[PDB]
């Protein structure tokens, strides 16, 4: 007790000095390209699913300090890395941007997230190096290949190119990264923002003119022109991103089975009662009639939803916060008595 009661005072002493100091510090979240592979969504990665390396850094510390700590921590030379701060934009995108105190560089943002380009350690073992970047005449671009058969996106890395380069001149690389033959016919889009995927028509103009509002971190999506895919449910990247925009995963818990973890169903925000009900039924091998849904409140099932509801799944889900997992309670009614 005697020496035990001193340690309980030492712990409250150290934990209060840290509470006071915590305003002097900021999070820097380092995200690495390997996290972009497999991402099926808009922009480069999912904020929630991605995995960061995390740095606790004095707000008024310098960049050079961070870089040094960074290169030594991560195990790279200082001149074999490039920092591309992630920038939340007004149009609803977050993108690597181009790059005094850390906090002023983050534009007061905290946590600050940064895309750290490095060389692939495998390829660097055989003499690969960080390519240089004329911050004025070059642009960094991201490539995605859409496959209409599987209706999926396939990250195809990034490229450094002179801004003055023709779109046509990039086709060989897209074809190659996608595993296609040179001079395979491609349809190209700028992924602009969610629900905006503009086709690029003139391939014989510079990148400044081809994309609207050209910046580093811009994304071009491409795809074959295979006829077998006219058949497909989402024949183009444009249509794929539209489907995605209106997409939502909802968890359905059976109110009568308490603590039922429930199951996830992928629905559309622009569905109606019938569509919602019918989908969930096909999952349970039952009749839509036999399902009663309850509204969303608190945690717990709310008021019962009436089957003549005229609204949309959006309307039902409009009281959920961005990070909140979307859940609706239901229960099953009897066929006979």
């Amino acid at each position: 007790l005697v020496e035990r009661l001193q340690e309980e005072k030492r712990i409250e002493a150290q934990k209060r000095k840290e509470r006071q100091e915590a305003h002097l510090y900021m999070q820097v979240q380092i995200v690495a390209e390997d996290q972009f592979c497999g991402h099926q969504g808009n922009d480069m990665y999912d904020e929630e699913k991605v995995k960061y390396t995390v740095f606790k850094v004095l707000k008024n510390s310098s960049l050079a300090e961070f870089v040094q700590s960074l290169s030594q921590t991560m195990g790279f030379p200082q001149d074999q890395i490039r920092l591309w701060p992630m920038q939340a934009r007004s149009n609803g995108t977050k993108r690597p941007a181009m790059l005094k105190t850390m906090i002023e560089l983050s534009d007061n943002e905290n946590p600050w997230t940064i895309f750290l380009e490095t060389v692939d350690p495998e390829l660097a073992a055989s003499g690969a190096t960080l390519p240089k970047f004329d911050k004025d005449h070059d642009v960094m671009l991201f490539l995605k290949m859409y496959d209409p058969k599987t209706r999926s996106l396939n990250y195809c890395g990034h490229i450094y190119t002179p801004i003055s380069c023709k779109i046509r001149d990039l086709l060989p690389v897209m074809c190659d990264r996608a595993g296609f033959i040179q001079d395979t016919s491609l349809i190209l889009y700028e992924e602009v923002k969610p629900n905006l995927t503009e086709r690029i028509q003139d391939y014989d103009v510079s990148l400044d003119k081809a994309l609207d509002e050209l910046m580093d971190g811009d994304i071009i999506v491409f795809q074959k022109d295979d006829p077998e895919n006219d058949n497909s449910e989402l024949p183009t990247a444009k249509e794929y991103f539209r489907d995605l925009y209106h997409r939502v995963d909802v968890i359905f818990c059976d109110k009568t089975i308490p603590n039922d973890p429930g199951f996830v169903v992928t629905l559309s925000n622009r569905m109606n009662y019938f569509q919602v009900a019918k989908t969930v039924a096909q999952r349970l091998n039952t009749d839509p009639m036999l399902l009663q849904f309850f509204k969303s409140q608190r945690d717990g099932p709310g008021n019962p939803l009436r089957h003549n509801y005229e609204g949309t799944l959006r309307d039902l889900l409009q009281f959920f916060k961005p990070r909140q997992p979307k859940k609706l309670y239901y229960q099953q009614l009897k066929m006979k008595i």
């Binding site: 007004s90 149009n91 995108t93 642009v139 801004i163 400044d208 509002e213 050209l214 910046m215 580093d216």
Partner: peptide, 9 residues
Amino acid sequence: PRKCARKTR
């Protein structure tokens, strides 16, 4: 030719 400094739509 140049990059834009900011998006606006």
